[PDB]
Amino acid sequence: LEVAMEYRTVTGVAGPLVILDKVKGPKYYEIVNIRLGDGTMRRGQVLEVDGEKAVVQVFEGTSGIDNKFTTVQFTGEVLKTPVSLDMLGRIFNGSGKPIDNGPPILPEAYLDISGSSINPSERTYPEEMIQTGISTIDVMNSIARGQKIPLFSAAGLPHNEIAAQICRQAGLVKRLEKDNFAIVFAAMGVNMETAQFFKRDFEENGSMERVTLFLNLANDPTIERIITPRIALTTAEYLAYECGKHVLVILTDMSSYADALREVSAAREEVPGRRGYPGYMYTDLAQIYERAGRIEGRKGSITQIPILTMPNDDITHPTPDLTGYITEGQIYIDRQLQNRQIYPPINVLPSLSRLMKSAIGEGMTRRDHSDVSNQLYANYAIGKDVQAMKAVVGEEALSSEDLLYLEFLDKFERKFVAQGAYDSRNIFQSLDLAWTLLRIFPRELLHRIPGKTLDQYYSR
Amino acid sequence: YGYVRKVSGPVVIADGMNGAAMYELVRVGHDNLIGEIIRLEGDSATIQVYEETAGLMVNDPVLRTHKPLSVELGPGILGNIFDGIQRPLKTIAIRSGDVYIPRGVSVPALDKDTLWEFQPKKIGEGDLLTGGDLYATVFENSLMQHHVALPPDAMGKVTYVAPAGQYSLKDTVLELEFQGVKKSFTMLQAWPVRTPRPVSSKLAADTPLLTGQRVLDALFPSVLGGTCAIPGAFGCGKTVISQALSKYSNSDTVVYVGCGERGNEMAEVLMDFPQLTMTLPDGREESVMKRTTLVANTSNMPVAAREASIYTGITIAEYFRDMGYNVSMMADSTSRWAEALREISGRLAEMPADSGYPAYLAARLASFYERAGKVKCLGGPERTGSVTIVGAVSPPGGDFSDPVTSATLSIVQVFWGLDKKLAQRKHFPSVNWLISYSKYSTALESFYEQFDPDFINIRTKAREVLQREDDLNEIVQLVGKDALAEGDKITLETAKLLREDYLAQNAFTPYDKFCPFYKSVWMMRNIIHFYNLANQAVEKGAGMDGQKITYTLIKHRLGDLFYRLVSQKFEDPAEGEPALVAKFKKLHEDLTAGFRALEDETR
Amino acid sequence: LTLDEAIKTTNRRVNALENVVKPRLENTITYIKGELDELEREDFFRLKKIQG
């Protein structure tokens, strides 16, 4: 019922910031619209306020602003994103404006982004598996609804192809156990060409009733790149706990998000933190991640698979080393496997899930999941060791078991890991492939497999 | 209007500006230096001077212009050399006999008195025209026609179109009436240096670059309208790759904007390209100066001019793409550009970020690179054109942790990472095949399939061979080749042959000056076929030995084929495809004769 | 003879080479982080003091 005053007291412009003069009673994170002298419109966010002063960070840059013709019309808001159940199946810009040639969202609620945290008393341990279609993920590094598992990558590695495959093939394992699965897909600072890739994948996927592609290009303004993952997390939280639907979220290149936070912090004249990244970057990433988890009072859940780029192909970088503690896993993409032309280059042996035991079980998935996972792990290690030995022992002195492990390693690299870009694989047939590889060894040789399982499956 | 208050380096604070918008170019002092606004604090506004600031007074008048940094477009833009602020260098050198560039010279970017021929594109009176519609064509020079289009911000009905004949830029070649008012248009078109030209819609590239060099065109390809990044190396890199992209590329024109580089190198480039008789047409030897353009700004040039040079270069790319040509712009800058940002940011008292570079470096590099990509043009007829950005990165003396390098690799799609170790070994194309990558390998699937339906498999096999050799190099560094088996030995032999035959190129001789795609793919297929047949033979194990014994057998009793394989690089492209293809097919047949004749007597 | 040669090489690698490299890595880490990072904060802190 209050029409916000449109101050015209610009008294300083520098970089992305504009300092108003005599604003009456601002708000710290208010949102403000700017009508330049030429009539064009820009939206800006309000940073630190002071006595009658309010520094405004302006989207889309600050070119053309003049201290005698630019009006700064306040709103008195904190960026309540419009949220509704029909937000699904549409592509959205970085700031939420639809770009799918459709109408703006008619909202069932205006939820403020950066939502309040879950009460730790109300959380519940994650359970059941989430089928992704990639054998290396659903066999040896299983994923459970409620985890927060990073996908560590590096520049040049095909992170986005794996992202698209996860977005398309994701499903619920409980099909044979006896459709409330939604995939909020967030992409921060993608390249100009991969934008076409994402648009094509989300324009011919075949399951559009599930995904919601929040998209933020590289040349889009930075503050949009900060807000985009928060918008995506808010929409996912709504669709999970306010609509009782299982939700999966893929955050692409959160290293770009960290760089965006670094860019914003510097503009506020704050001293840079450790290794250049601000010290509050730990708090920011914890705020982004911890929104996941399973709530006892709600039937929904949030599972995150944030894709992170590790610069210089090492984990010592502040962002991967920092996100290692918060999360409970690491699915590395290995450069050498990409060189070896294995399309999913996931280094399975280095990769692990800190809580992969919950996904493995009797009710969910299949009984032999843990046994086959451990056997595959151990046999791969042995095969790698045997290949290394054969590199130096001439391979003539290798015993029969050494040759068995060598051929198993070759088969595992060239038939199991190298899944096609579109070869969707249910966990049951993935485990059938695992048993196909395993049955080469004698039944007595599979030491890691417990009894009553070999008799069940080793007979094929 | 306004007067100077403070003069520190290239940063000038002039009071009395009041209503002076950001980036609104102002003219400083009696000498009338160009200059752009960078900050405001009230009645005063910071200015970047783009020129030497020595001799500025206090209360020296500063005149505002209300116009952001703008470059003047039109005919004759091709084949010229422009300063970062787009001053015609040759025009300055001729009009003023002095060999120097005088301070504060005011020369039009394009000559306004040269007579140009006008060919209207059948536009009738009373017709309707719109932004970017292509109403007339002008032959700026032979083998490079220049279409003339309305500016994107223009529309109306065609009341008057000039007839065909000789015209100068001062004349009005077209008239339009819209919304009850009329406007006129000349052959000039001023455009802000930022705010990229409008595009009807972007597109996903399919055509490869197919550059002259074999490594680039085969292992790590780039698409027309793509995006690349080389580490600005000398001897290699900034010279051989620049020559290949300029005189031996399928791009319809070149825009060299290398700024912040050595003056001697710039003089060498600007004296060698005048002759440069590349056979760009089917049967013509027109010099590429009728095809390229330089925006050279040497290192000694003012620090504030680097960004202006880069943005004018990319803006010129856009004008040509809009006409329809597939321009390819090469920037030897962006290594000095980061330094320019550091200088201005520090002088403007901005808070630094990781490694001292301004926090918004990634944003600027993105706003530059993301202007690449092939684009469906504005206006009528329907048309398509592309812009390629083959930029530069810090030389291979610093790891990828460099903020400029990380920012580039976070955006750039193809990385031609040259390694200094290869440069020491005098391998001249010098691309490190372990660290380079090309994310365009998936979009080029159609072109590779239609050209040769088996090239993808042989390329993957070559990649696997190179990776395997690089993998066991460490093991050999410990134990040695004593334990190497038949497969390892043959893999290393093929890797060495690939390294010295395929991946090398002299480029100073007709053997390797320009390798067409067919010759490169034939070399790859020959080498991979030899590798596969040799592996199959050593796996056969006939004669109770096979293995490394068979490897020595094929390296000694069958080594003439090996020598012909390693000398296949010398197939002269001037002989023509029907001859080289026949020669390579014969060599393939002879190779198939081997490893079968070798298997005849069971080794 | 071969076992003696291999054992000598392995013992040399375990004792000399690795224990030579690891102090070098520690010294390089200390030189960068212990000095350059500390100086960068001190420089910026002095600059902020000048502004204040």
DSSP string, B242-275: HHHHHHSSS-SEEEE--BSS-HHHHHHHHHHTTT
Q: Which residue stretches of A292-414 are H helix?
A: 318-326, 335-339, 369-393, 400-411
Tokens of A275: 């290794």
- Residue in chain C closest to B352 (alpha carbons) equals C44
d(CA B278, CA B467) in angstroms, rounded, equals: 37
Chain C: residue whose CA lies nearest to A316 = C29
Q: Coil, strand, or helix at residue B20?
A: coil
Residue that is written with structure tokens 């009230």 in the block:
B42
What is the rounded CA–CA span in Å between residue B524 and residue A38? 59
Q: Which of A271, A274, A275 sits opposite C48 (nearest CB)?
A: A271
CB contact under 8 A, B351 and C44: yes
Q: What is the experimental method?
A: cryo-EM
Residues 134-193 of B with CB under 8 A from A: none
**Count of CB contacts below 8 A, A vs C?**
9
Does residue B381 have a cis bond before it (omega within 30 degrees)?
Answer: yes
Contacts of A343 (CB under 8 A, 6+ apart): A158, A161, A418, A419, A420, A421
Give how far the C-alpha of residue B417 lies from the chain's centroid of Cα atoms, to the nearest Å.
15
Are C44 and A271 a contacting pair at CB < 8 A?
Answer: yes
Give helix then strand counts, H and E, for chain A.
Answer: 12, 22
Taking an 8 Å cut-off on Cβ atoms, the answer to whether C41 and A271 are in contact is yes
- Which residues in chain B have their CB less than 8 angstroms from residue C51's CB? 349
Chain B, nearest residue to C6 by Cα: B479
Note whether C40 contacts B351, CB cutoff 8 Å. Answer: no
| C44/B352 Cβ within 8 A | yes
Kindly state whether A201 is in contact with chain B, defined as any CB-CB distance less than 8 angstroms: no
The identity of residue B165, as a single letter, is G
DSSP letters for B89-134: HHHHHHHS--SS--TT----SS-SS--EEEEE-SPPTTEEE-TT-E
Show which subunits contact B, needing at least 3 CB pairs below 8 angstroms. A, C
Residue B283 phi, psi (nearest 5): -140, 30
Residue with tokens 């070869």: A423
Distance CA A151, CA A310 (A): 10
Q: Which residues of B touch A255 (CB under 8 A)?
A: 410
Task: Tokens for B447, please give them.
Answer: 């072109």
Find, among A425, A128, A180, the residue nearest to A294 by Cα.
A128
Q: Are B229 and B391 in contact (CB under 8 A)?
A: yes
- Residue B16 has φ and ψ, to the nearest 5°, of 80, 10
Place of tokens 């793919």: B521
Instruction: For chain B, give percent helix, strand, coil, nearest 5.
Output: 35, 20, 45
Query: How many CB atoms are closer than 10 A to CB B454?
Result: 12
**CB contact (8 A) between residue B22 and residue A65:** yes
Which of B15, B44, B354, B459 should we substitute to test contact with A (largest number of A Cβ atoms within 10 Å)? B354
Angle (nearest 5°) at CA A278 between A275 and A282: 100
Q: What residues in A contact C40, CB-CB < 8 Å? A: 272
| Rounded Cα distance, B470 and B463, in Å | 11
Length in residues, chain C:
52
CA dist B44 and A13 (Å) reads 11
Number of helical H runs and strand E runs in chain B: 16, 24
Q: Is B515 annotated as a binding residue?
A: no
Interchain CB contact of C2 with B (< 8 Å): no
Contacts of A409 (CB under 8 A, 6+ apart): A380, A383, A384, A386, A387
A309 lies within 8 A of chain B by CB: yes
Q: What does the alpha-carbon distance between residue B299 and residue B264 come to, in Å, rounded to a whole number?
A: 11
Dihedral of alpha carbons A233, A234, A236, A237, sign: positive
What are chain C's partners, defined as 3 or more CB pairs within 8 angstroms? Answer: A, B
DSSP label at C33?
A: I
CA distance to partner chain B, nearest, from residue C21 (Å): 17
Residue contact B349–C40, C-beta within 8 A:
no
Q: Mind telling me how many Å the CA of C37 is from chain B's nearest CA?
A: 9
- Partners of C40 on chain B (C-beta within 8 Å) are 356
Give the minimum alpha-carbon distance from C51 to chain B in angstroms, rounded to a whole number.
Answer: 9
Using a CB–CB cutoff of 8 Å, tell me whether A37 touches chain B. Answer: yes
Instruction: Find tokens 């791969």 and name the residue.
Output: A380
Q: Which of A123, A152, A359, A358 is nearest to A251 (CA)?
A: A152
CA A358 to chain CA mean position, Å: 21
The answer to whether the CB atoms of B353 and A266 lie below 8 A apart is yes
Q: With 0-12 CB in 10 A as exposed, 13-18 as middle and 19+ as buried, what is B122?
A: exposed
Residues A430-445 as b/e (b if ≥16 CB within 10 A, e otherwise) read: bbebbeebbeebeeee
Tell me whether A65 touches chain B (CB under 8 Å). Answer: yes
Residues from chain C that touch A275, judged by Cβ atoms under 8 A, are 37
B197, B152 contact by CB (below 8 A): yes
CA atoms within 13 A on the CB side of A285: 30
B541 in a known ligand binding site = no
The helix (H) or strand (E) run that includes residue A9 is: none
Token pair of A89, please? Answer: 């199946």
Q: CB distance C51–B349 less than 8 Å?
A: yes
Residue B18 has its nearest CB partner, among A68, A276, A388, at A68
| Phi, psi dihedrals of residue B321, rounded to the nearest 5° | -65, -40
- In DSSP terms, B137 is beta-bridged to B119, B147
Report chain C residues whose CB lies below 8 A from the CB of B356.
40
- Reading the block at residue A255, the tokens are 């290293």
Cβ A250 vs Cβ A305: under 8 Å: yes
DSSP code per residue over A325-345 = HHSSEE-PBPHHHHHTT-SS-
Tell me how far CA of residue A113 lies from CA of A39, A87, A236, A246, A249, in angstroms: 30, 16, 11, 20, 16
List subunits contacting chain A, requiring 3 or more Cβ pairs under 8 Å. B, C
